[PDB]
Every structure is written in structure tokens, then in C-alpha cells.
Design a protein around this ligand. Sequence first.
Ligand SMILES: *[C@@H]1O[C@H](CO[C@@H]2O[C@@H](C)[C@@H](O)[C@@H](O)[C@@H]2O)[C@@H](O[C@H]2O[C@H](CO)[C@@H](O)[C@H](O)[C@H]2NC(C)=O)[C@H](O)[C@H]1NC(C)=O
Length: 368
Amino acid sequence: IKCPQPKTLDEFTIIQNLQPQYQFRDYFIATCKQGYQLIEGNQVLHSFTAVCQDDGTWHRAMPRCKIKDCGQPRNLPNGDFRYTTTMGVNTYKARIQYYCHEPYYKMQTEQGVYTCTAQGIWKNEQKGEKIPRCLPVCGKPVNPVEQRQQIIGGQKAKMGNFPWQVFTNIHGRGGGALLGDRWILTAAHTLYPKEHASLDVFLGHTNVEELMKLGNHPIRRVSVHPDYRQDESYNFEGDIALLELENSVTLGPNLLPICLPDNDTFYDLGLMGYVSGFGIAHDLRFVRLPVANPQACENSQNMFCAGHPSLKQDACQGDSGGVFAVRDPNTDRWVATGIVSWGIGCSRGYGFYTKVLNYVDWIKKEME
Ligand SMILES: *[C@@H]1O[C@H](CO[C@@H]2O[C@@H](C)[C@@H](O)[C@@H](O)[C@@H]2O)[C@@H](O[C@H]2O[C@H](CO)[C@@H](O)[C@H](O)[C@H]2NC(C)=O)[C@H](O)[C@H]1NC(C)=O
């Protein structure tokens, strides 16, 4: 007819339905303060109810209330996190901080702070239960072309110089630029040559053999801009394409994306940019040339001319599908202003190029 008016085994247990005395058939309930869960031996309990049996004894043993554990923080692809609290303890109230592998990636928004909630899972000051996202940083080579030089003509390209450079080889050697994590910008005629599929694509290195040793990157999808017409002898309008990599590449010092242009001034006469390509020249080379007066090439409005006559062959460095890159110092970022297009007359000193700014919209649309 009586049970022992019982007590907690710690400061984390709380008694529910507490009475002055406990008669047979009665019951009391146990729970825990925030952050603590009911444990019985080596077992978590959703709840605890003890009924007072006739022999005057509680049908079950008072449980214990222990701290909860949010477990091992999820992994942040291209980043990492550190404990901001005793290291390695994923217990209630612990605090960790995620971060990205800068300078190559940047965290998508101290916002990578997740603490272990009373609910037993890592959460943000309102960034959810979801972890941050580390994004590819575009146009900031970690070994950029020295500006302390203006070396007229072709130069041997060093590693890190054009980290976005893509060596293509589908219907002949071609080029392209890595955009983001998984896109390569290039020319349409590179995939569909005019005058009449195995998309062999390589990246990450200055040397061709080394590039090929690094391995091909499978293309998952191809997008040729709607204008581009190949049956027509010469239009070069819409000569631009996008390739989507089946898998994404890992950024680093020799493999980084280039940025997209957005201001018309990237096509002002006299503005210096760069062009890189192979010639299988065995090694990647580059030329610094200026945006030339359209007549220069005339001799479209979705294109631009670049070169100088005192350059002869050196104005054919770009590989077709390759990118005309500009270093915008008022933001210190490299952008892809042009796409190497029909190279007729590049030995007279000038190159033709598709104006990328005019297709940024379409590109971005394709990339989503
Ligand atoms: C559109 O571009 C203008 C040109 O900016 C220059 O050329 C870019 C390609 C890049 O290399 C940048 O670093 C250069 O400054 C830009 O600047 C123009 O206006 C500013 C006033 O804000 C003036 O100081 C500057 O001299 C101008 N540029 C020129 C031709 O010298 C302009 O602000 C920009 N606007 C847009 C649409 O964002």
C-alpha cells in the first residue's frame, strides 16, 4: 500500500506528478532538463514512468539524466570546421566553426558557427541545421601574370598563370575556360566545325603530356548557343558553347575559374588583354595584345578584333575556344572578355573574338 517517496540520481532528472506520498497503483514520471536525456543503463529512453506496485515497490528503477550528444559535425565539402570549445567534444552546448579552403573557395552566406542544440543536432544562430556551402572563387590566380612586365610577344606560360585554361581535343586541338566548378566556356565551331563525337577535355597543367596524364574530364552536356549556324559558310554569330563536366573539379593553384564580364568598357579600343594556347606546342604560351579597331579585322557586333601588326604569327596564340582574358584592376579580377573565334588573318597580326559580355545572360541561364 506504499511506495518509497523517491529522489533523483542527479541534477538533471525532474519528477512529474510529484505527490506528498505514493500509494499503490500511483505513478511518477521522470524527464530531464534541456540538453539532457533519460538513460537507463546503456539506453536512451524517450520517457519514464514508474507505477507504484502493491508490494509497496516501484515497478522500475529510477533512471539517470545525462548530457546529449550531437555527434560528429557533418563534413563541409571544400571546407572544414574546428571546435571552438573543448576539442572533439560534440556534446550539448559544444560550438564549432566551419570555414572554406580559401583562397580557392569562399563561404556562402563568423556565420559558420554551429552549436550543439538541446535538440541534439548542430544548428546555426539561424542558418538552420544545414551546413554552409563553399563556392569556387573566380579570376584570382594564386600565381598571376606579373604586371611588372610588358614582354612584347609570345611568352612561355608558367603554372598558375591561366588557371582557368582548358585543353580541348575533339575535332582537333582546341581551348576553353573553366567556369565555376564544372563548366567550360568555349567556341561552338570547336564542337561543330564549319566547312564540315569524343569530347576529350583536359585541365590543370601547363604541359600537354602532363595535362593528358592528369586525365580526361567527361562531358555530361553540351549547349551550343542558338544563333551559331554551322551550315552557313561564315556567320560566326553565336559561336560560343558551354560544356558541363560530369563531375566537378577541385580548385587549387593550378586550376581556378575565370570570371564573366559585365561592363561594356571591356571592349574599348586599346585595352590590353591576354590570350593563351598551345601553338600540340607541347607547352602553353601566351600573348598580351590590345583590342583593335574592328576595321583592322574587317579589312558582326557580337565580336571584336584584337591584335597589332607588329605581331605577325604571335597573334594566333589562342587555341580556338580559348579565352581572351582581361585583368580588371578596379576589382583586381580576371574576366573572360572574349572567345577565340575564326583565326583567319591572325598572321597579319589580328585575331577575331566572340564578345562574351553579349552572352553572359545565356551562359548563366545555362549554368542553372
Ligand atoms: C564601366 O566600366 C568603366 C571603365 O572602367 C575601366 O575599364 C574596365 C574594363 C576595368 O578595367 C576598370 O578597372 C577600369 O576602371 C568604369 O569606369 C569609368 O567610370 C569611372 C567612374 O566610376 C572612371 O573613374 C573611369 O575612368 C571610367 N573608365 C574609363 C573608361 O576610364 C565604369 O564605372 C563602369 N560602370 C559600370 C557599368 O559598372
